[PDB]
Amino acid sequence: PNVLLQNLCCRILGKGEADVAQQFQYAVRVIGSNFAPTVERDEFLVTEKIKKEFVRQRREADGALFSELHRKLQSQGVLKNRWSILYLLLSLS
Amino acid sequence: PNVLLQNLCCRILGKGEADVAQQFQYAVRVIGSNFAPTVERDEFLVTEKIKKEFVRQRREADGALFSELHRKLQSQGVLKNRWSILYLLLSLSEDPRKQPNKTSSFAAL
Amino acid sequence: QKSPNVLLQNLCCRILGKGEADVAQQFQYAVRVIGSNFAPTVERDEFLVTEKIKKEFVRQRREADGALFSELHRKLQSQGVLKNRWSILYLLLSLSED
Amino acid sequence: PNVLLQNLCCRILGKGEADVAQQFQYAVRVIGSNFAPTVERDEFLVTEKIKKEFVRQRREADGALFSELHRKLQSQGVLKNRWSILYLLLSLSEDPRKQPNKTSSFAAL
Amino acid sequence: DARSWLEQHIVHQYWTSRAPRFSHSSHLHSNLSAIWDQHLYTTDPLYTPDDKTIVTETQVIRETLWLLSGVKKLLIFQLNDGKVNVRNDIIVTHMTQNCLRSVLEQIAAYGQV
Amino acid sequence: AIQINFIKNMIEETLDDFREACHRDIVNLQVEMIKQFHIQSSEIQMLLERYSLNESLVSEIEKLREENKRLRANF
Amino acid sequence: AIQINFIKNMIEETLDDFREACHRDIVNLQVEMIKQFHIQSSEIQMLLERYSLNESLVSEIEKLREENKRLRANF
Amino acid sequence: MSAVRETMDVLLEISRLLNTGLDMETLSICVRLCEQGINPEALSSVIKELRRASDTLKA
Amino acid sequence: NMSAVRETMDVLLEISRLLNTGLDMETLSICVRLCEQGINPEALSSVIKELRRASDTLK
Amino acid sequence: AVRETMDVLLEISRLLNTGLDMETLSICVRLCEQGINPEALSSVIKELRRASDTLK
Amino acid sequence: MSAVRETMDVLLEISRLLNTGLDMETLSICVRLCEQGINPEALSSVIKELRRASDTLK
C-alpha cells in the first residue's frame, strides 16, 4: 500500500519518488483518517448518482454511453469492489 | 473589560480571585477568536425563538407570561443591547424533563 | 473497582488483545476523547429513542427483530435497575447494523 | 497575490505597517489552502438572491437598477469571472434595519 | 471584602454548590454514609453513586421546623397542596439516604396537613 | 394553493429547530478546538523550559556569584 | 386532515434520513479533530526533545571543554 | 441608578422561567459586557464552558 | 443482588444480539456501568465506536 | 475593463449601505481574473472590515 | 497484466465522460489501492490537492 501511495504522488506532481516527501506525509495523514460517507458499499447507488448528475448538467448523452460501458465492466467479472473505484471518479467529477 | 470578565471568572466558580487565572486567560483567548453570528439584531426574531421554545418544552403558560414581561421590559427602559441579552438567555434555556446524566461522577475520569 | 478510568482500561485491554501497558497509548487517546465537551442530545423522552431503534429495524427489513425488541423494551423498563436507560438505548442505536 | 492582499490590508486598516501584519498573514493563509469552492459558476442563482435582498429591504427600485447595470456588464464583454464578483458583493451586504457589533477597548483583554 | 465576611459567618450554601460543604466529623460512627455508600459501590456492579446535597447538621431540621408552621421551602420538592413530598438528594452526615428519607416523609406529612 | 402553504409553514417550523441544533454544534466545536490548543501550549511551555536549558546550571551560576561577592565584601 | 398527516410524516422521514446524515458528518469531524490534536501533540513533544537537547548532552559539552583544558596545560 | 433597579426585577423573571441559572451579581456582569459590546456567540460559549468546568472542579 | 445483575445483563444481551454487534457481553456490562457513572451519550458512543475502529485495523 | 466595472460595483455597494471605497473594487477585479477563490476572497474582506471596526 | 489493463481502459473512457483528464497511469494506481482497502473518500481528497498544488506552483 505504502509503495502504491508513493507511485500516486509521483504521477500527479511530475515524476520523482523523492523530494515529494512533505506532500506524501500530508497524504498519509489524510489516508490515516476517515472522511465522511454518504453511502457505504452500494455500487448500485453510485451508478444512480452518476446518472442523476448527467441529467442535471444537460449531458444526457454522456449518461446513455456510461450505462453500456458499465455493463461491459460488469460482464468481465473483475474484482476490486466496483463501488469504491466508481465513487472515487464521481467524487472528482 | 478586564475587571468585568475577571469578576465573572471569580463568581462562576464561586471561589478564587487568582485561582481562576486559568479560566480567565481561557475566556480571553475564546473572546479573542472572532465568531460571526447567524442573524444580528431584530427584536421580533429573537423574541419568536423564545416563544416557539416555550411551547416546545411544555411551559405554555410561562410562554404566555414572557410576552407580558417582554413589553414591560421596554417600558422600564429601552435596550440597545437586547438581542445579545435575549440570546444569552436562549442558549442557557433547558427542558424541565430529564437530567444531564452525572457531571459529579464525570470529574473522576 | 468501577471508576470511569478503570472501566475504560478494561475495555482497551481485552479488545486489542494485549496486556495493560501494550494498550497504554490508546488508553491515553481514549481519555482525551471522553473529556471532550459534549452537550446532551437527550434531555427528554425515553420513548423517542425507543422509536428510533424500531425505525432502524424497519429500515433494514428486520421486522421480526422489531416485534421482539418491543416486547423486550417493556421487560427492560420493568426490572428498572438501570437509571440511565436512554443513554444505553442511544449507544445501541449507533451500533445498529445488518 | 500577496502583493495585492497586502495593499487591501494596508489601505483599509490605515497606515501602521505593523498593525496590518495580522490581517495580511491570515489573508495569505486562506488563499494558500486548496479547495474547490462551492457556489462558483452559477451567476444565475447569485443574481436572483440580490434581487430578492432589495425586496426584503423595502427598496423595490434598487433591484430594477441592478438588472440594468448587470445587463450593461454582459454587453461590454468585460469579466471572465462574473460569478465571483457577484459572490463577494453579496457576502458583504448589510441591511440598514439591523446593527453590526462595535467594540473598542477590546484590546485590553 | 464583604463576600469573604459573608462566607465565614453564614452557613455554607446547599441550594447552590458555590460554597463547599461540611462533610467531616471525627468519630468512626458519624462517617456512616460514606462507608455504607462505599460498601454498595464494592458490592453492586451496576451502582449509580447518587449525587447528594451535603448538610451541615441541624439546618434541614430548622427548615422542616419552618414548614411545620409557616411557608414552603425549595430544599423540599413539594408539588400541589395535597402532595408535599421530599427532595431526592438531601442527606445528613451520619445517616443512610434511604434511612433519612424515611423520617423526612413522616414529618413531610405532618407539614402536608 | 392552500395545502402548499400548510406544508410550507410546518416544514419551516421543523427546519428552525434543525438550524439551531447545527448552530449550537459549531459553538461546541469551537470550544473543543481552543481547549486542545490550550492544553498543548501548557505542555510545550513546560518542556521548552526544561530541555532548552539546564535549570541546574543557572542556579549554580547564581550560587558562585553569591559566594564570590560575599568573600570580597570582607576584603 | 388525515392525508395531510401522511404527507407531513413522509417529509419528516426524508428530513430524518438527511438530518441524521448531517449529524453523523459532524460527529466524524469531531472525532478526527481530537485525533489530529493528540497525534500532533505526541509528535511535537518527542521532536522538541530531540532538537532542544537533554541535560545529559549538556553535561558532555561541558566535559569536553574540561578535556581541552586538561590536555593543553595539565598534561 | 433608579433605572438600573427596575430593569433587573423583569429581567430576573425571564431568566428564571427560561432556565438559565445565574444569580443576581452575575446577571449584572453580562449586561455590562453586552453594553460595552461583545459577540453574542462568545458570551454563551464561555458561560456554558465555565459551568461544565466548575461542577467537575468541585466534585 | 447476584440475581438482579444477572437478569439485567440478560435482557440487554437479547436486545444486543438483535441489533447485531461483534461485542461480547463483558464489554457491554462495562458500558452500563460507564452510563451509570454518568457521562453524555455522545462521548460514550464515540469512544466505543473508536475502539471498534482500532480493533479492526489492528487484526 | 476596470473603470467601468468599478463604477457598476460602487453603485451596488452604495444601495446596500456598505462602506467600500474605489480602491477595493479595482484590486478585487484584478485578483478575480488571475484566479482567486470567491469564498477566500470574500472572507478576506469580511475579516478586514471587522478588524477596522475593533481597532476604531 | 492484461486483466488490470482491461479494467483501467474501461475506467479511462468513463473518466473522459465525466470530463476529467486523469491519466491512464493514475487510474491503474487507484484500482490497486482501493482493492487493498482504501476508503474512496479520503483518496479523492489526495488526488485533488496534489493536482491543484502542481497548478499553482507553475
TrEMBL record, chain E:
It is found in: Cytoplasm, Cytoskeleton, Microtubule organizing center, Centrosome. Belongs to the TUBGCP family. It comes from the Eukaryota. Component of the gamma-tubulin ring complex (gTuRC) which mediates microtubule nucleation. The gTuRC regulates the minus-end nucleation of alpha-beta tubulin heterodimers that grow into microtubule protafilaments, a critical step in centrosome duplication and spindle formation. Component of the gamma-tubulin ring complex (gTuRC) consisting of TUBGCP2, TUBGCP3, TUBGCP4, TUBGCP5 and TUBGCP6 and gamma-tubulin TUBG1 or TUBG2. TUBGCP2, TUBGCP3, TUBGCP4, TUBGCP5 and TUBGCP6 assemble in a 5:5:2:1:1 stoichiometry; each is associated with a gamma-tubulin, thereby arranging 14 gamma-tubulins in a helical manner. Gamma-tubulin at the first position is blocked by TUBGCP3 at the last position, allowing 13 protafilaments to grow into a microtubule. This is Gamma-tubulin complex component. The chain holds residues 207 to 319 of 1019 of the full protein.
TrEMBL record, chains F, G:
It comes from the Eukaryota. It is found in: Cytoplasm, Cytoskeleton, Microtubule organizing center, Centrosome. Interacts with FAM29A. Interacts with HSPA1A and HSPA1B. Interacts with gamma-tubulin in a HSPA1A/B-dependent manner. This is Protein NEDD1. The gene is nedd1.L. The chain holds residues 597 to 671 of 671 of the full protein.
